[PDB]
Amino acid sequence: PLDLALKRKYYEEVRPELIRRFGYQNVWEVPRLEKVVINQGLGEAKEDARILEKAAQELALITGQKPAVTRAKKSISNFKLRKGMPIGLRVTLRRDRMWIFLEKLLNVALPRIRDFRGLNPNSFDGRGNYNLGLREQLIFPEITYDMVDALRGMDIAVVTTAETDEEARALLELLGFPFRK
Amino acid sequence: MLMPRRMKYRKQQRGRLKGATKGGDYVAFGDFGLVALEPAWITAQQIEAARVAMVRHFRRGGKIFIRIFPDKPYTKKPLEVRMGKGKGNVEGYVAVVKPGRVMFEVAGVTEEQAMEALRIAGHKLPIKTKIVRRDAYDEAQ
Amino acid sequence: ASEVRIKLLLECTECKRRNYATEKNKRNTPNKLELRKYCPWCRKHTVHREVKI
Amino acid sequence: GSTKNGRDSQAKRLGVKRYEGQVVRAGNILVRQRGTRFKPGKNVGMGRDFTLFALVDGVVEFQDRGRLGRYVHVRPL
Amino acid sequence: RLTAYERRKFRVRNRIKRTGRLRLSVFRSLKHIYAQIIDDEKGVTLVSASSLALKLKGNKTEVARQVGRALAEKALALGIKQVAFDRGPYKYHGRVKALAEGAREGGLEF
Amino acid sequence: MKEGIHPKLVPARIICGCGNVIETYSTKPEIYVEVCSKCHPFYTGQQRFVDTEGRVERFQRRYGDSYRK
RNA sequence: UAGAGCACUGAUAGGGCUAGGGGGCCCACCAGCCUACCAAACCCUGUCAAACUCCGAAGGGUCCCAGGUGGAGCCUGGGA
RNA sequence: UCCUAAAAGGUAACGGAGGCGCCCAAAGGUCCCCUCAGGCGGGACGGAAAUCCGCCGGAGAGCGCAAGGGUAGAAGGGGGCCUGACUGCGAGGCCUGCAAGCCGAGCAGGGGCGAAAGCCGGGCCUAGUGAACCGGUGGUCCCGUGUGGAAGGGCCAUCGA
RNA sequence: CCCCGUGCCCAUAGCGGCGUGGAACCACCCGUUCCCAUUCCGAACACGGAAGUGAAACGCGCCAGCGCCGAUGGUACUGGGCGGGCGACCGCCUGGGAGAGUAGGUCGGUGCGGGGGA
Numbered sequence: 004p005l006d007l008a009l010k011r012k013y014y015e016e017v018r019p020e021l022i023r024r025f026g027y028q029n030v031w032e033v034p035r036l037e038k039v040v041i042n043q044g045l046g047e048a049k050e051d052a053r054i055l056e057k058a059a060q061e062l063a064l065i066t067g068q069k070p071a072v073t074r075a076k077k078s079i080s081n082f083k084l085r086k087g088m089p090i091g092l093r094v095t096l097r098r099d100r101m102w103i104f105l106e107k108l109l110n111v112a113l114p115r116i117r118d119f120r121g122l123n124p125n126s127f128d129g130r131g132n133y134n135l136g137l138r139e140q141l142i143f144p145e146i147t148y149d150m151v152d153a154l155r156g157m158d159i160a161v162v163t164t165a166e167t168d169e170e171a172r173a174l175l176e177l178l179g180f181p182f183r184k
Numbered sequence: 185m186l187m188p189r190r191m192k193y194r195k196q197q198r199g200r201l202k203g204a205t206k207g208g209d210y211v212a213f214g215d216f217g218l219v220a221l222e223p224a225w226i227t228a229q230q231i232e233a234a235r236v237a238m239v240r241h242f243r244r245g246g247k248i249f250i251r252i253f254p255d256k257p258y259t260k261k262p263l264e265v266r267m268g269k270g271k272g273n274v275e276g277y278v279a280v281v282k283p284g285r286v287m288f289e290v291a292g293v294t295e296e297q298a299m300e301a302l303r304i305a306g307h308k309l310p311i312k313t314k315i316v317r318r319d320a321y322d323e324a325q
Numbered sequence: 326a327s328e329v330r331i332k333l334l335l336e337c338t339e340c341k342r343r344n345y346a347t348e349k350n351k352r353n354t355p356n357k358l359e360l361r362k363y364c365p366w367c368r369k370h371t372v373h374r375e376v377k378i
Numbered sequence: 379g380s381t382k383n384g385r386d387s388q389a390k391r392l393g394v395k396r397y398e399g400q401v402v403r404a405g406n407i408l409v410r411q412r413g414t415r416f417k418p419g420k421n422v423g424m425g426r427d428f429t430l431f432a433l434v435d436g437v438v439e440f441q442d443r444g445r446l447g448r449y450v451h452v453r454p455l
Numbered sequence: 456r457l458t459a460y461e462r463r464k465f466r467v468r469n470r471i472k473r474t475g476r477l478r479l480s481v482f483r484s485l486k487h488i489y490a491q492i493i494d495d496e497k498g499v500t501l502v503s504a505s506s507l508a509l510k511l512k513g514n515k516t517e518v519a520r521q522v523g524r525a526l527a528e529k530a531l532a533l534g535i536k537q538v539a540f541d542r543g544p545y546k547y548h549g550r551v552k553a554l555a556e557g558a559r560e561g562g563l564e565f
Numbered sequence: 566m567k568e569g570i571h572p573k574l575v576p577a578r579i580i581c582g583c584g585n586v587i588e589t590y591s592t593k594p595e596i597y598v599e600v601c602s603k604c605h606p607f608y609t610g611q612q613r614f615v616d617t618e619g620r621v622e623r624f625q626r627r628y629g630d631s632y633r634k
Numbered sequence: 635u636a637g638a639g640c641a642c643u644g645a646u647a648g649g650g651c652u653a654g655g656g657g658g659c660c661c662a663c664c665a666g667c668c669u670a671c672c673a674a675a676c677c678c679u680g681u682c683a684a685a686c687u688c689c690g691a692a693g694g695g696u697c698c699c700a701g702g703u704g705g706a707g708c709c710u711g712g713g714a
Numbered sequence: 715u716c717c718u719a720a721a722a723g724g725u726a727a728c729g730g731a732g733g734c735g736c737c738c739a740a741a742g743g744u745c746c747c748c749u750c751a752g753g754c755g756g757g758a759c760g761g762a763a764a765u766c767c768g769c770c771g772g773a774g775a776g777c778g779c780a781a782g783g784g785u786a787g788a789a790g791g792g793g794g795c796c797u798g799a800c801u802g803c804g805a806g807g808c809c810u811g812c813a814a815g816c817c818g819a820g821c822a823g824g825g826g827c828g829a830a831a832g833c834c835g836g837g838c839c840u841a842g843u844g845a846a847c848c849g850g851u852g853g854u855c856c857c858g859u860g861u862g863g864a865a866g867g868g869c870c871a872u873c874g875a
Numbered sequence: 876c877c878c879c880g881u882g883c884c885c886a887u888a889g890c891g892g893c894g895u896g897g898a899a900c901c902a903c904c905c906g907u908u909c910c911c912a913u914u915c916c917g918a919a920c921a922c923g924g925a926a927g928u929g930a931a932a933c934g935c936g937c938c939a940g941c942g943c944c945g946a947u948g949g950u951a952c953u954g955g956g957c958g959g960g961c962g963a964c965c966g967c968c969u970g971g972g973a974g975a976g977u978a979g980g981u982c983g984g985u986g987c988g989g990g991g992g993a
């Protein structure tokens with residue numbers, strides 16, 4: 004595996020601080036990062052130019068991983084939705100790629116957000132997972148203003164082995180997640 | 185008055201009326217009850233008449249519990265028509281009452297008030313009735 | 326069977342003898358049906374082609 | 379007036395045909411059913427309409443297996 | 456609640472049972488591999504073979520091929536010939552496939 | 566992974582405007598950014614860019630204390 | 635199936651709790667406070683069902699062995 | 715299809731309720747993989763309900779369509795390769811006045827999938843239909859009215875309710 | 876006696892809670908070169924390994940909050956035989972005999988084959 008600043012920071016500075024702060028008895032009992040699933044809810048490309056390959060290209064550039072499609076589980080009248088119609092994207096990032104993307108997200112992305120005042124503290128799962136949203140894709144460094152055609156945000160779900168929101172917030176803020184409160 | 189707000193089927197067969205009551209044979213709410221002695225289909229008009237009579241006797245005060253609800257749809261063919269050509273049209277709703285069911289219960293009223301109100305209520309019914317009070321036999325069920 | 330769902334025959338491409346009758350949707354499947362059926366005159370498998378009944 | 383009701387289908391004469399212990403031959407239909415109210419057991423096949431038929435000559439025997447269902451077998455002779 | 460593991464296990468095993476043949480049941484751990492021929496008519500195991508009982512070397516693939524050879528050799532001694540391969544929840548590939556190939560190399564009929 | 570469908574990750578230099586350099590991995594080996602976490606106002610303590618005013622209203626008038634008393 | 639039962643499909647009276655509205659204070663500065671008002675879901679107490687059943691008889695049916703010699707039974711054909 | 719139908723089958727009325735006269739070239743065969751509806755919490759536009767994550771959840775979802783039965787230890791969702799939606803038959807039964815309708819192991823021919831055991835003679839099942847007579851089309855090369863041919867017919871397949 | 880496979884009974888076996896087990900076995904685990912794999916992801920599947928941990932999963936104990944099981948007695952109902960009511964319906968005899976509820980039970984039992992132990 005690759006040598007990364009964020010993974011090394013975890014194993015070096017975040018592990019012992021956590022063990023001290025909570026008093027874990029086992030090495031595995033400590034909270035670890037499990038996965039980070041990114042999902043462009045899209046749905047704007049139902050009809051119109053359903054060719055959403057620009058958005059999937061953007062995701063493949065930001066994550067270094069080609070996303071997959073998501074389709075409708077049912078047809079919906081008001082949403083102009085036919086069952087089985089491609090309406091979104093979802094890429095599951097784990098391990099080294101997860102660390103890479105989280106590094107670039109914490110060091111570049113979250114700063115470049117318009118009127119950024121921190122991440123919402125109450126956005127925790129209750130089981131020890133966190134979620135957030137993004138209004139644009141220009142936030143990430145791999146996306147410039149020329150190669151973009153339309154603004155399209157995304158959803159980020161970070162899944163942690165922690166059991167309470169307390170341990171999860173500890174791990175995430177220690178890793179460098181900026182919380183507004 | 186009393187009738188179901190919705191049903192799975194509009195018309196029912198007539199069935200039978202044999203046996204004592206399946207349930208509701210013991211007081212369970214009020215201080216007194218009116219219990220049936222002979223089986224019948226008690227129409228919603230009769231139940232409403234009995235209720236109105238009891239509350240009109242109380243004038244104000246007390247509490248009335250109606251433990252039967254008319255869910256059986258009564259049917260009747262149009263006047264002066266011959267047999268056949270379908271089943272009749274629903275003209276009302278009845279409650280299957282069998283021997284030994286408490287149809288009404290009164291609570292929170294003097295003994296004389298409850299007795300006389302249950303009497304005037306029974307006089308609106310198409311069957312013989314008995315006035316009962318809550319016993320430890322009821323309390324044990 | 327209707328007007329859009331037609332009945333048809335299958336012809337052994339090798340001896341030109343119709344051997345099977347079936348049905349297709351000419352709107353959902355506007356090409357001639359090609360399959361591989363057992364031709365008994367040839368006593369072997371053969372690609373049969375759709376033929377107007 | 380009139381009616382829109384009077385119609386029904388010819389009864390289908392379904393059910394068990396060879397109760398447990400009944401000696402049977404190869405091919406005797408054992409059960410007729412919609413769905414798998416009884417499931418095929420040893421030496422018992424099932425057909426495209428859920429019909430259980432004996433695969434060998436023998437004797438019918440039932441076996442209720444709790445949550446696994448009800449099975450019919452043919453003990454060889 | 457069942458897991459896809461158990462569902463897959465049931466799904467292949469019932470279709471094995473229906474064929475009324477003896478089943479060479481395979482089990483594959485992270486370290487070793489085990490295989491026993493079962494007659495489900497009596498709920499009895501006839502012949503067993505494993506790398507834990509035969510004390511075998513390193514390569515799990517060649518190890519499984521050797522345990523298959525041993526299982527087939529011990530099976531042909533008891534009159535067994537035809538059998539049905541119980542691959543369990545394991546895809547017929549790699550270690551389990553090598554076990555099956557070793558079993559066939561010993562004369563087992565499947 | 567599936568070969569031929571993923572943009573290759575390579576060692577990447579992410580340069581910030583404040584002079585911060587970040588050694589990471591990305592599809593573009595060099596990327597310049599206008600801001601990073603080491604110089605954003607919310608991160609670096611409370612570097613309130615222009616407005617660290619104090620409201621300043623309303624009692625901050627005090628022009629002046631010349632009315633008689 | 636009879637009976638029974640409410641776990642499923644529906645009905646259902648009272649009470650509890652409680653999305654939602656109605657109404658009343660209090661506001662357009664967006665929220666608040668009170669409900670002897672109608673009331674979803676959920677629980678409590680008490681019920682109803684040919685097309686409801688977690689239950690479920692007596693009987694009924696069929697095969698086996700046995701008693702059963704009766705204007706009993708089985709096969710082929712004539713006549714109604 | 716369900717009720718009436720009185721716990722085997724069957725059972726009537728101008729008795730109570732609904733559906734059918736289609737469809738699918740995959741919605742068929744096989745091998746491999748996967749498991750719902752719903753409730754709670756979290757999440758840019760995004761909402762009761764679009765897609766994402768977590769936890770609870772045995773089946774209340776799904777199974778083209780009426781109803782019932784059946785069903786995740788799949789009959790449901792996805793993919794691969796395919797045409798068994800076979801030809802010659804058919805032990806033995808369900809049902810039943812007749813005629814019909816239905817299920818069918820197995821043997822052979824040439825196949826499909828599978829490493830294999832095996833499975834496949836359309837479809838989770840129960841409606842999606844029409845006896846003969848007359849005639850059309852393809853094949854067969856059986857009859858050919860003194861003989862050789864032809865006309866016309868027979869036989870196999872399918873059409874015109 | 877413990878563990879690992881694989882059946883049978885078909886919840887007296889389940890949910891939840893607490894505790895225990897890593898020598899062995901099993902699991903997680905270290906890797907992703909090779910085989911194989913993801914409608915993206917070595918999560919799953921799959922291969923090569925053996926540093927660590929029993930944190931998860933699993934196994935084994937204990938608890939009756941839920942769930943499941945459930946007598947005895949009586950009753951409903953009823954095959955057969957008799958009565959009563961103008962009827963709706965109601966009794967008696969004989970044989971059978973529920974469902975609900977009560978007491979109570981249950982945090983499984985057992986077969987075959989392997990590895991270890993006395």
Ligand SMILES: NC(=[NH2+])NCCC[C@H](N)C(=O)O
Nearest residue numbers: 692953954955965966969970
């Ligand atoms: N043993 C019996 N089957 N009894 C039936 C009782 C019926 C009788 N007609 C009655 O009213 O009581």
Ligand SMILES: [Mg+2]
Nearest residue numbers: 014030031035
């Ligand atoms: Mg570690």
Ligand SMILES: [Mg+2]
Nearest residue numbers: 125126127128
């Ligand atoms: Mg929170």
Ligand SMILES: [Mg+2]
Nearest residue numbers: 130131163165
């Ligand atoms: Mg968590």
Ligand SMILES: [Mg+2]
Nearest residue numbers: 141143144146
């Ligand atoms: Mg950018």
Ligand SMILES: [Mg+2]
Nearest residue numbers: 196197198199
């Ligand atoms: Mg009547």
Ligand SMILES: [Mg+2]
Nearest residue numbers: 225227258278
């Ligand atoms: Mg009347």
Ligand SMILES: [Mg+2]
Nearest residue numbers: 198258259260
């Ligand atoms: Mg009437």
Ligand SMILES: [Mg+2]
Nearest residue numbers: 259260261272
């Ligand atoms: Mg009438």
Ligand SMILES: [Mg+2]
Nearest residue numbers: 263264265266
């Ligand atoms: Mg007249």
Ligand SMILES: [Mg+2]
Nearest residue numbers: 258275276277
């Ligand atoms: Mg009336």
Ligand SMILES: [Mg+2]
Nearest residue numbers: 306307309311
């Ligand atoms: Mg009266």
Ligand SMILES: [Mg+2]
Nearest residue numbers: 207208325975
């Ligand atoms: Mg009760």
Ligand SMILES: [Mg+2]
Nearest residue numbers: 344345346347
């Ligand atoms: Mg055909």
Ligand SMILES: [Mg+2]
Nearest residue numbers: 380381382383
């Ligand atoms: Mg009409």
Ligand SMILES: [Mg+2]
Nearest residue numbers: 382383385733
């Ligand atoms: Mg009609």
